[PDB]
Structure 1
C-alpha cells in the first residue's frame, strides 16, 4: 500500500531539474571549496542565471553567480544547460557525528535584472570520507563505527514513519553512545537523512535489493536480463541522497550473493560519486563489489568454516593474504531476546585492532505488531500471530529496544 507521503509539486516553466553539491579540502583541512553543479530543464536562454550562496545561520559566507554552460568535455563540447559554481570557504566547520555544524546553501535560478524564477535550498556538511592505507577516514581521522541497524517499523502503524518516532529513535541512539545508523535494507524516509544531518549520525544508505529466497542467492543478480531492474534500484537512490552529509557510505544491497550486476553497479557508484566508499556483503564480504569488508555476525576468535563463502574471525580476516581493506561488520551481535553475550569481546577487538572500525548491531527495535484480545487489551504479536504460514515466528524481534519503545536490558 501507499506507506509514504503523497504530494503535488508545482515547478516553473524554466526549472532547476537537478543540482549537486561536493566538497574538496586542502591537506590541512583548513581550506574548502564547494563545487556545485546545477542542471536545468529548459526552456534554455542566455539571460537567465543561477546563484548559489552558502549561509551559516543568518550570515552568508560565500556566493556564486554564473551563466549556464559547462566546460568542454568532448569534441562536441560541454553541457549548455548545466553550470558549475565552486565557492571558496575559508576555515570551515567540519561535519561529524560529534559536531554537526551544518551549512545552508541556496540555489536559485534567476533572470539577469534580476527576478528569481525558482529557488532551491540544501543543507551542506563539510567532511571527507575516504579510505586511505586501508582505513576508513573522516576528515583525516579514523572513525570507530558504533552503529546499529534500523528498520522503519511502528507497532501501531506498521511501516509508516512519523516525525516524532524518527526523533525519538535518534535521541535514544545518541543517548546510548551510537554515532551511526544503517538503514537496512532499503532507502529510508527523505526526512530521516535530514534529521541525521542536524543531530549528527553516520548513515549507510542501502539500495533496495535483496534476493535471499533464491537458489542460488545470486540467480537474479548474475542474470543480465535482471540488470536493468537492479540498476534502477541503485541509481535512483544515489541521485536522491547524494547531497546529504550524514550519508557517508553507499550500499549495493543485502544478500543477494555475488553477481556481475553487483560489480557493474559498484563501478557505477564509484564513477558518479567518488566521495563515498561502496560496501556490499554478498559473496563473502570480500568481493570486488565492496570497498570495505563487511561480514555478517562474523565472530571475534572462532571462525565458521563454510564452503564457497567462509566466515573468518574478524582478526583473522584482516590478516588474509592480499587484504588491505578495513573491516566493518554490517551486521553483528544478534540482539534477539536475551542477547549481547560476549558483546564486550567485539569492542575489545575494535579498540585494539586499527583496521577493525566497529560495526552495526542487529537490531535496534523489535518488529512486533500490536494485536488486541477479546477483552480488548493490546498484546505484542510476532511471526505467525496473524494466521500466516509459512512464517519465521519470533525471529522478527531482534531489537535493542521494544516497540513502544522501551529499552531492553
Structure 2
C-alpha cells in the first residue's frame, strides 16, 4: 500500500492521519508552571541518538526494518541533516531545481533516510488521554510506523507534523520507524536558494494531552485611539466530551501580578442560522494603560489558558507570551502602535556551517544579539517558517518578524506555472494556513508572507484573502509577479534600486522613489530583499538609507542576507575550511552564490556589517557652528541609556573631548553646545567625532556599547611654512640601462628599458621584490563577476568587459624616460602606454622628484581611453621586501572601506596588525582597501598624499587565481597597492553591473601625487 500509493508523487496528498495545526502546546497540569513557562512533564523530547540507515530509493528498504533494527544501521544524533553525517552530498543550487522538472514526479533514485528509535512509554500515558508525536521538521516527506504499524504521512519540511500514537503504543518498550524521502512533490514548492539537504532536522517530541483538551486558542489585542485602553480577546477551542461543568479561565499576568481574568462555560455567540460553536468560547479582558510591545521595548504579558471544572479542578493549562501591539496600514504607511515604522531588517536563513539546517538556541541568540547590536530591528524568515524557538526569542528580545510560508517555485517556467494551477492550491494552502495556525499568537510576527519567488498565480490571491479573513491584525505581503500585485499590502520589491529603473518586461523593478508615486499607487514600500551582501559588497548602502529617511512611504527593507551559507570541510590534516557550491561533488551548482552574508558562517562579521550598523543608526546628527543637534529616530523610547561622547582631534592628535548625557524624547531633538576650543598652533585638519554610548548593560548589549557615531571636518589650517632647506643634494649616475639616484646611503634605481623604479636601497638592503608599476585592474569581486562562467560568458559583467578590453593582459610600452638635475633634486620623467592588440588603453605620465631630505615625490597623470570600460583602479603597486607586524595610517578606518562603502569609517590615526589589513572573504578578491588616507606607515616606509591603499601578503594575481581562501599562501615580502582612485564595489545586486555612475572611473584624465620617504 505504502510503496504502491507513491504519496510523495501526489500533490493531492500532503499528509495522511496528521493532526490539526495549533499554537505551541505543553499540556501543563499545573497553572503556575504554565505562568512561568517552566518545563512540562507532559512534553518529552526525543532529541537523542536514533538508529539510521541510508538507502538509494524507498524500494530498497527491507520490510524487516519495520519491526527490527538493521544490523547495518548507524547511531546518529537527531535532529540532523544526513548530508552533514556524510551519507550523501548536500547540493547547492540557486534557481534550477536539483531534480528534473517533471511535476509531480521525482527521480526513481530518491535518497531515503530510515530513522528508528527504541524508547520507553510509561503506562500512565496510555491509561488515559492522548499521546501524540511531534516532528517539528522533516525534509522533505516521510512515512511513520509505530511498533510495525503504519501511522501516517507528512509533507512541508518547515512546519510540525503531528500524529496520535495513543492506539499504537504499548507500556514499556516501543519502536518508531521513520522513512524520510529526500524528494517529493513537496520539493516543487521548496526551491529556495540554499543548500538542498534532508532528514529529521528539527525537534521530535511526545506530548500527552487529556482526552478533554484545549485544541486551539487565539489571542487578539484591540486598542482605543491613544493606546491607553486595550481589550484582550482570547478564543479557546476544545476537543473531547462537552459537559456543563467545563470552564475556561483566561488570566493575564504582568510578571508576578495578575492584571485581568475571565471565566466562562463553553458555548460561543450565535454565528448563523444553525447557532454557534458549543465547543468554543471567547473571553474578553479589559486592560487599562497596557505596556506596549515594540522592538524598542519588548514589553510582554503572560496569558494563561486553563481548562477546568466549575468546582476548580484543573484539567490542563496552556499559555503564551502576549505583546500588546497594533499593526496597521493607514494612508500608505505601515504603523506600529500608531507610529510609522522604519524597518532596519535582514533576511536570515537557518544555517549552521557544521550542523547544516539544524538550529540550536545558542546560535539563534547569538544571531539576535548581533543583529540588535548592529541596529537591526527586523528579520524576514527567508523563506519558510522557522524553528518555533525563533519567534519566542524575537518576542522577548524585540525584533519585528515577517513570517513566510514555505513556498518557492523559482525554477518553474514561467515562475507561476504551479501557483496559477488550481491543482496545486491544496498543497499551497496548507503551507500558508498551517503557518498562520502555528504562529498567530506571536507578537513579534507583524507581517505574513505568502512565500517567495513563485510568480503571481490565482492561488496567491486566494491565500492572500484567506489570511486577511482569519487574521485582520497583520498585513500580508508577497513579492512575486512584480512586487505590487493584488496579493500584497506592501510594495515589497527585491533589489529595486534607489534612483535607477530596471524596466524588465512584465515585472519591472522601478526606482523605489519612482515606484511609490506610480499613477494610482498608495501602498508603503519595504524592500523584501536589497543590498546583496555577497563578498566585498554593500556599495551604495547609504543611498538606500538617505532615501528611506527622506521619503515617508519608503519604510526600509531587509538586507540580503544575514549569514554566509558556507559549509565546513576538512583537509588531510583535519584542518577545517569553508566550502560553497560544488565542493561536495554537487553538480549542477551555483558556486559561491550561497555566501551573501553580513557575517561569515561562524558569525564573524564581514566589514559590510559596520556600514549597515552606521546607516541604521537611531540617532541623527547635524552640526551648525558650535551646536550639535541630536535627533532621535526612536518611536517609543526616550534616550534613557545614552550618553554622547565628543572628541576634537588634529590629524589624529586629541585636543579636546567631553561627554553630555542624552535626554531626547522619541522623534525629539536635543541641542548640544560645544565649548569654545583653542585654535591649535600646527597646521592640519581638525575633526570632530561624536559617539553615542550606552552606559548600562541591556539584555542584548554590554555596558559601553556604541550605538551611533558621526564625524565632521572642523577648521583646517593649511601648511604654508616652507620646510627648512636640507643641505644635502642627490647625485644622478647614468648608464645605458639605468638612472641611479644616490643620497649618501640611499639609492633609487630606475630601469631605462622599462621606465619603472626597479629598486630602492637603504645601504646594502634591497627594499623591492617587484618594480613599482601602474596598476589599472583588481582581482574581481563577486559583484564584478556576477553570473559569468567559463562555459557561458556574461559579456555585460564588469570582469568580462575588462577581460575583453585586455585590461588584465595589457603590456606597458615605454614612450619616455628622462633624468634631469635640479638645484637641490633629481627629476625623473616617464611616460608609458598600455596597449592591447594595437589599441591604447591607458597612458601614464609620471615625474619622480628626489630631494636632499630623501623624499621621493611622485606625480602621476593618467589618460584613460573614453571607449575602454572604466578601469577598476588607477594606482601603483609593488612587492616590498619587508614583512612588518603593524600597519599605521592616518585615514579612514579601522575596517576595510571602499568609495561607495566608507560612511561607517572614521578619519583617525589607526594601527592594526598586518593580518587585519586582509579580509578573509571565502572566495578571494580585491579586499582590505582603506580610503581617504593621508599618511601610511609600514616598516621603514612612509607614504603621504591622498590615496586609497591595501597591503597584504597576497598579490592581486593570486587573489584572482584562487577560488578558496584556505588555498592562499603568503608571498615573499608584502604587496602594496596605492590607488589615487578606486572604482565602487556596488552590490544593489550581484548578477548585473551595480556600481553607480558617480563611483565609476569615467573622468578620462586622472591626477594623483604621493611622497615616499623612509621613516
Tell me the secondary structure at the aligned position of residue 216 of structure 1.
coil
Q: What do the CA deviations read for 1:76-124 (whole angstroms, capped 9, x no partner)?
A: 1010000000100000000000000000010010001110000111100
Q: What do the CA deviations read for 1:189-225 (whole angstroms, capped 9, x no partner)?
A: 1100000000000000000000000000000000010
The 1-side partners of 2:544 and 2:312 are apart by 60
Shift of 1:228: 0.4
The 2-side partners of 1:404 and 1:220 are apart by 37
The 2-side partners of 1:190 and 1:389 are apart by 33
The 1-side partners of 2:466 and 2:574 are apart by 53
The aligned residue for residue 585 of structure 2 is 387
Tell me the secondary structure at the aligned position of residue 344 of structure 2.
strand
Shift of 1:296: 0.4
Counterpart pick for 2:364 among 166, 180, 194: 166
The 1-side partners of 2:326 and 2:332 are apart by 16
The 2-side partners of 1:41 and 1:134 are apart by 42
The 2-side partners of 1:57 and 1:276 are apart by 27
The 2-side partners of 1:333 and 1:190 are apart by 28
The 1-side partners of 2:286 and 2:480 are apart by 41
Shift of 1:9: 0.3
The 1-side partners of 2:313 and 2:526 are apart by 50
Shift of 1:278: 0.1
Shift of 1:251: 0.1
The 2-side partners of 1:145 and 1:192 are apart by 19
Tell me the secondary structure at the aligned position of residue 346 of structure 1.
helix
Tell me the secondary structure at the aligned position of residue 298 of structure 2.
coil
More strand by share: 2
Q: What do the CA deviations read for 1:314-371 (whole angstroms, capped 9, x no partner)?
A: 0000010010000000000000000010100000000000000000000100000000
Tell me the secondary structure at the aligned position of residue 491 of structure 2.
coil
The 2-side partners of 1:285 and 1:385 are apart by 34
Aligned residues: 408
The 2-side partners of 1:28 and 1:61 are apart by 20
The 1-side partners of 2:232 and 2:277 are apart by 20
The 2-side partners of 1:13 and 1:115 are apart by 15
The 2-side partners of 1:186 and 1:88 are apart by 35
TM-score, normalised via structure 2 length: 0.40
Tell me the secondary structure at the aligned position of residue 40 of structure 1.
strand
The 2-side partners of 1:274 and 1:363 are apart by 29
The 1-side partners of 2:200 and 2:537 are apart by 35
The aligned residue for residue 413 of structure 2 is 215
Counterpart pick for 1:297 among 488, 492, 495: 495
The aligned residue for residue 255 of structure 2 is 57
Tell me the secondary structure at the aligned position of residue 281 of structure 1.
coil
Shift of 1:256: 0.2
Counterpart pick for 1:280 among 469, 478, 488: 478
The 2-side partners of 1:180 and 1:289 are apart by 22
Q: What do the CA deviations read for 1:282-315 (whole angstroms, capped 9, x no partner)?
A: 0101100000000000000011111011110000
The 1-side partners of 2:433 and 2:314 are apart by 31
Shift of 1:404: 1.1
Q: What do the CA deviations read for 1:145-196 (whole angstroms, capped 9, x no partner)?
A: 0000000000000000010000000000000000000010000011000000
Structure 1 position 185 matched with structure 2 position 378: no
The 1-side partners of 2:500 and 2:368 are apart by 34
Shift of 1:238: 0.2
Q: What do the CA deviations read for 1:370-401 (whole angstroms, capped 9, x no partner)?
A: 00001210000000000010000000000000
The aligned residue for residue 137 of structure 1 is 335
RCO (CA 8 Å, sep 6+): is it higher in 1 or 2? 1
Q: What do the CA deviations read for 1:217-246 (whole angstroms, capped 9, x no partner)?
A: 000000010100000000000000000000
Tell me the secondary structure at the aligned position of residue 254 of structure 1.
coil
The 2-side partners of 1:119 and 1:228 are apart by 33
TM-score, normalised via structure 1 length: 0.99
The 2-side partners of 1:402 and 1:310 are apart by 32
Structure 1 position 239 matched with structure 2 position 443: no
Shift of 1:28: 1.4
Shift of 1:407: 0.4
Shift of 1:35: 0.5
Q: What do the CA deviations read for 1:31-52 (whole angstroms, capped 9, x no partner)?
A: 0000100000021111110000
Tell me the secondary structure at the aligned position of residue 603 of structure 2.
coil
The 2-side partners of 1:41 and 1:76 are apart by 20
Tell me the secondary structure at the aligned position of residue 117 of structure 1.
strand
Q: How does 1:79-94 map to 2 (within 5 A)?
A: 79-94=277-292
The 2-side partners of 1:125 and 1:264 are apart by 29
Counterpart pick for 1:108 among 285, 289, 306: 306
Shift of 1:405: 1.3
Q: What do the CA deviations read for 1:241-300 (whole angstroms, capped 9, x no partner)?
A: 000000000000001000000000000000000000000000101100000000000000
Tell me the secondary structure at the aligned position of residue 206 of structure 2.
coil
Tell me the secondary structure at the aligned position of residue 22 of structure 1.
strand
The aligned residue for residue 428 of structure 2 is 230
Tell me the secondary structure at the aligned position of residue 200 of structure 2.
coil
The 2-side partners of 1:114 and 1:304 are apart by 66
The aligned residue for residue 403 of structure 1 is 601
Tell me the secondary structure at the aligned position of residue 379 of structure 1.
strand
Shift of 1:13: 1.2
The 2-side partners of 1:29 and 1:376 are apart by 59
Q: What do the CA deviations read for 1:128-154 (whole angstroms, capped 9, x no partner)?
A: 000000100000000000000000000
The aligned residue for residue 350 of structure 2 is 152
Tell me the secondary structure at the aligned position of residue 230 of structure 1.
helix
The 2-side partners of 1:170 and 1:242 are apart by 21
Unaligned 5+ runs, structure 2: 1-198, 607-1015
The 2-side partners of 1:189 and 1:142 are apart by 29
